[PDB]
Design a protein around this ligand. Structure first.
Ligand code: CL
Ligand code: CL
Length: 254
């Protein structure tokens, strides 16, 4: 009776990863349950032992608030995707190249996602750290609302500054660039990590080993996200990537 209970958040990056892992585990005989939750709630759920784990911990800086609160109540298994990043992203036609260069562009507004995301906390730290951003403000919306706003700005050739991150499909759709962050307040060496509930190793060893071994690359996640943007369901997008990289996937289960 193989069994696993996973949580994830509503970011295009984590929809791809949770669907890839879920389908892989299903093909190897696991009964898999998944639940989409707010950032802080996903962390709390694993910390209470109501979920077995998640593969969506952006560390060290992005989810530092959650790590300070819940870090002692979970088992950090380590990076599953190396070399991720967060920062202020602008269209490449904008003349500014650094966060220090921003003055009165884009109505002095940072276009954000949902208030509970880690990138929003880092954005608020950034607004208080750079003196030139004194009169600026972070406006929350959502993951989906941000990309829709990015598209409309670009059609009109507007100034816009968004709370962006990699991996994300938008870099292969629009011509964008990260603003330099010499103070490093948006994070500097982020990885996407796997965490599991304490006791999983002992109680559910089969699930623990798979979750411990799970890993893939920026390009792999980009590939799955790409399919979802072009009309494929997350399930069939996950299945397509697994088939294409079957021997890579098999390594998680040995
Ligand atoms: Cl890991
Ligand atoms: Cl956070």
């Amino acid at each position: 009776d193989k069994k696993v209970d996973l949580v994830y958040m509503n970011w295009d990056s984590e929809v791809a990863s949770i669907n890839v892992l879920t389908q892989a585990m299903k093909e190897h005989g696991f009964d898999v349950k998944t639940t989409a939750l707010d950032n802080a709630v996903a962390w709390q759920t694993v910390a209470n032992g109501q979920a077995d784990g998640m593969v969506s911990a952006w560390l060290p800086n992005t989810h530092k608030t959650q790590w300070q609160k819940y870090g002692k109540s979970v088992d950090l298994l380590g990076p599953n995707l190396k070399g991720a990043k967060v920062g202020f992203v602008v269209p490449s036609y904008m003349n500014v190249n650094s966060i220090e260069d921003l003055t009165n562009q884009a109505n002095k507004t940072i276009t954000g996602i949902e208030p509970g995301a880690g990138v929003m906390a880092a954005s608020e730290k950034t607004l208080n750290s750079y003196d030139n951003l004194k009169d600026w403000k972070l406006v929350p919306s959502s993951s989906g609302a941000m990309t829709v706003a990015l598209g409309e700005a670009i059609k009109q050739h507007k100034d816009i500054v968004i709370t962006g991150w990699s991996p994300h499909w938008m870099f292969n759709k629009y011509d964008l660039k990260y603003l330099a962050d010499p103070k490093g307040t948006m994070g500097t060496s982020e990885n996407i990590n796997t965490i599991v509930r304490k006791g999983l190793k002992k109680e559910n060893p089969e699930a623990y080993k798979v979750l411990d071994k799970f890993n893939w690359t920026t390009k792999d996640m980009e590939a799955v996200m790409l399919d979802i943007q072009n009309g494929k369901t997350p399930e069939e997008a996950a299945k397509n990537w697994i088939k294409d990289h079957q021997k890579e996937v098999d390594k998680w289960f040995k």
